[PDB]
């Protein structure tokens, strides 16, 4: 039937996937591979073990250029990212005419001929520029100046505000008032520039929800992939300039206007800004101009270039009910912050005192009112005036390490610190998320939520005060940006007809947006950055303004669906030990493992390892993940340390060698061997490549010049950038798959292993679908490149696929905050989402994502 098993044991994909993807015939394992493969199983004890079949996957996936699976993604990205490669080279291969002499002082664009004559001008007209805007932090957010290059001519643009003079400005951010950088309907265009997300936010036709048709490329995105740094610079763009092309160094202008002045300071000095912004562009222009050829000669595959592009359309739409959530959000702050300063009013007067004068204000102040007014969660004497204890052992701060506890007894722990010189109790550190070797400013911060919820974090209104402040954690360290996210309200006019002809339309409903700095690939391993909105918890219960995910929501006649992959970078080691041993799905036991591993029921690699631990499930993918990437000893043993404490340091010493012996092995004789075999095969291999995109490393970390250094972070590389290529080959792939089959929706934010979407309410399950397939294409592919003809069905697909009006993790949760304590129905009248698995998709899509 279409039930099908290894000689392992193990089902695969079914006949038709396995049919339509790997083609038909084979190289037969061998015989000798085969007995060692069982041998190896046997020496664990795991061989024999009989597993209940999973459902049969019956699809009929879209048709697959070429004749074969890394053919048809290299044909993908190609097809994608031809046109800006055309327009990148274009800018490259070109002539530059000398800087105009005086800048116009008009409103609007203006061309400059090349005897320095000025022709006003719409917009330029240009496939490729360079960018530049100007902000001046005194009079808000709106952009004031714009020079932009091109291969013909250079252009510039004064801003509105600054040309005319007003007493007030409107308060509320508008398309009338932002940068014309758009050409509607050669084709597409490129935009050029050093973290050019910040001149994409200032574009006025970049808040649009129709579509986009251009891509940004920035400078930033491939000095990180080409000499990025943890022959190389930092990400600064006089120093990539000083790299790259070298010349004189790039002036800096210590007035900084624009930071520090007023609009009158640039009604005055127009001409030395212009200038440097010139100076800007053109620099920008000699770096692309020199970077272009070295980013396509070291990452041969188009791949990492088309998902490069793609990685920066990100978007967050923002209705109406953000308004009412910043008011929500900070009458909440208000009110809980007054009534956080009474209490620690009362716990002073049962425990004047020279730290009690300093929390009054004088008397001669104008905003004088009674008693200790002046109080915030922000301030370092909050914790030392409620005898916080760490698990029952009091809190102690050190000007050397940071905070601290003290444990009586004077036990084994992150320490102890002999620095500190406490009579009878010993000295330790509080855990940091950079290790121990960075020291923490502030207890007041989003790692320590995880030490409340187990007890570990207790104090003594006492546990009101640490519970408010775990309240306030996320709003308190980022409302400045979440505050000041440039929002930008469309008119009637320029929205959809499908959002006007919505039930849900409200025609007084107000409908904005926000466009995120993200930058494209931000890491050595070619990860993207974001301050904010990839580093941000979905929805919580205990936790003031962690909304912010549920306040992205969708206007009317539009959602978010979105997906995480199931045990990504696992499957990666997996198939790459698999294909490393014998050729076979299974052999090294560790594929083994995470074939079988099953959540509905309980038994899973993530389950296994938190129950011999003793941790969590999350605290058991995050060891895992650890793990895979090539850690010692000394790691793991921090981090069970830091998922419990109790363990004492020469137990964890122990108890990390007990974990070590069972996996590793000498690499042989270990559980995950093979895997570590192979990675350290490709990367040790001459100019080190990617096992399946072949895309090198950065120039910082090759082989040649390090010689045998820094080998964790180059092991560590191979299987990042492998999960860098899953993610681009999952963007270039549901790309492809919104464009054939004509699919209403647009790439909302993805955050690492999980991708967000932005899409109508008509077609949610189709999206749902494409995802799916997207993710079993992935690792047909990744499969395929290591040499293995067969995929297994248990990690074929999605575990769930999330559609919601809001961004959460579950499309459950009632996101009853401090703020909320209603809920979204009730607020905002959000309702609840829907999760659905493999089997409700196909059935609710019957197999089809047409209409």
Not at 219 to 245: C, D
Not at 339 to 357: F, I, Q, T, V
Not at 666 to 690: C, H, Q, V, Y
Request: glycine share 8%; aromatic share 10%; hydrophobic share 40%.
């Amino acid at each position: 039937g279409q039930l099908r098993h290894n000689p392992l044991d193990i089902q695969m994909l079914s006949r038709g996937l396995h049919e339509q993807i790997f083609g038909q015939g084979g190289e037969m394992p061998g015989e000798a591979a085969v007995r060692r493969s069982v041998e190896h199983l046997q020496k664990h004890g795991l061989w024999g073990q009989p597993a209940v079949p999973l459902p049969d996957v019956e699809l009929r996936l879209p048709p697959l250029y070429g004749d074969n699976l890394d053919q048809h993604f290299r044909l993908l990205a190609q097809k994608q990212s031809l046109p800006y490669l055309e327009a990148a080279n274009l800018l490259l291969q070109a002539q530059l005419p000398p800087k105009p002499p005086a800048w116009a002082w008009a409103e609007g664009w203006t061309r400059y001929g090349p005897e320095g004559e000025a022709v006003p001008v719409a917009i330029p007209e240009e496939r490729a520029l360079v960018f530049a805007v100007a902000v001046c932090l005194a009079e808000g957010t709106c952009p004031t100046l714009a020079v932009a290059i091109s291969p013909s001519a250079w252009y510039s643009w004064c801003s509105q505000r600054l040309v005319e003079e007003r007493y007030s400005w409107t308060s509320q951010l508008s398309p009338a008032d932002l940068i014309p950088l758009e050409v509607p309907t050669w084709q597409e265009q490129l935009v050029v520039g050093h973290n050019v997300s910040f001149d994409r936010a200032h574009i006025r036709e970049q808040y649009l929800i129709q579509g986009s048709r251009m891509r940004f490329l920035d400078t930033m995105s491939m000095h990180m992939a080409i000499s990025g740094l943890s022959i190389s610079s930092v990400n600064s763009l006089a120093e990539v300039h000083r790299l790259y092309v070298g010349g004189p160094p790039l002036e800096k202008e210590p007035r900084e206007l624009f930071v520090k002045g007023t609009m009158k300071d640039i009604r005055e000095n127009f001409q030395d800004l212009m200038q440097y912004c010139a100076q800007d562009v053109w620099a920008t222009h000699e770096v692309f101009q020199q970077q272009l050829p070295l980013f396509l000669e070291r990452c041969p595959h188009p791949v990492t270039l088309a998902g490069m592009l793609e990685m920066g359309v990100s978007y967050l739409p923002v209705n109406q009910n953000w308004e009412r959530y910043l008011a929500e959000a900070q009458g909440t702050y208000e009110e809980l912050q007054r009534e956080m300063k009474k209490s620690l009013m009362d716990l002073a007067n049962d425990a004047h005192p020279g730290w009690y004068r300093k929390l009054c204000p004088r008397l001669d102040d104008p905003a004088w009112t009674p008693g200790p007014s002046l109080l915030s969660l922000q301030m370092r004497v909050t914790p030392k005036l409620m005898a916080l204890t760490w698990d029952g052992f009091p809190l102690h701060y050190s000007e050397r390490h940071g905070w601290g506890y003290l444990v009586p007894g004077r036990h084994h722990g992150n320490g102890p610190y002999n620095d500190v010189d406490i009579p009878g109790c010993w000295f330790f550190k509080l855990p940091h998320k950079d290790g121990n070797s960075c020291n923490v400013g502030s207890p007041f911060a989003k790692d320590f939520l995880p030490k409340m919820e187990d007890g570990t974090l207790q104090a003594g209104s006492g546990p009101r005060a640490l519970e408010i402040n775990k309240m306030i954690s996320f709003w308190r360290n980022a409302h400045k940006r979440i505050s000041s996210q440039m929002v930008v309200w469309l008119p009637r006019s320029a929205l959809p007809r499908a959002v006007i002809r919505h039930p849900d339309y409200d025609e007084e409903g107000l409908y904005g947006a926000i466009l995120p700095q993200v930058v494209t690939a931000g890491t050595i391993t070619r990860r993207a950055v974001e301050p904010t909105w990839l580093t941000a918890s979905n929805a919580r219960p205990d936790r003031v303004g962690s909304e912010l995910k549920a306040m992205v929501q969708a206007p009317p006649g539009y959602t978010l669906v979105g997906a995480d992959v199931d045990s990504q970078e696992l499957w990666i080691a997996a198939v790459l030990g698999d294909a490393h041993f014998a050729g076979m799905h299974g052999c090294t036991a560790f594929g083994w493992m995470t074939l079988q591993g099953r959540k509905s029921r309980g038994t899973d690699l993530h389950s296994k390892t938190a129950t011999t631990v003793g941790i969590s499930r999350e605290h058991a993918k995050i060891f895992n993940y650890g793990r895979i990437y090539g850690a010692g000893q000394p790691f793991a043993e921090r981090l069970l340390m830091q998922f419990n404490h109790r363990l004492t340091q020469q137990e964890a010493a122990e108890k990390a060698q007990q974990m070590y012996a069972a996996t590793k092995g000498l690499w042989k004789g270990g559980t995950e061997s093979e895997m570590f075999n192979k990675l350290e095969s490709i990367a040790t291999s001459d100019i080190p490549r990617t096992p399946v995109l072949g895309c090198c490393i950065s120039r910082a970390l090759e082989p040649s010049a390090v010689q045998e250094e820094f080998m964790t972070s180059r092991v560590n590389w191979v299987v990042q950038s492998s999960a860098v290529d899953y993610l681009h080959l999952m963007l270039v792939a549901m790309k492809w798959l919104f464009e054939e089959f004509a699919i209403d929706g647009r790439f909302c934010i993805s955050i690492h292993d999980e991708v967000r979407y932005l899409v109508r309410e008509e077609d949610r399950y189709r999206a749902a679908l494409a995802l799916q397939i997207t993710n079993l294409l992935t690792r047909c592919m990744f499969a395929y490149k290591l040499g293995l003809n067969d995929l297994p069905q248990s990690v074929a697909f999605f575990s769930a696929v999330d559609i919601d009006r809001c961004l959460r993790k579950e499309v459950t949760m009632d996101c009853k905050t401090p703020s909320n304590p209603t809920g979204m129905e009730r607020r905002y009248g959000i309702p609840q989402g829907e999760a659905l698995d493999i089997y409700q998709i196909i059935e609710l899509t019957k197999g089809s994502l047409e209409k």
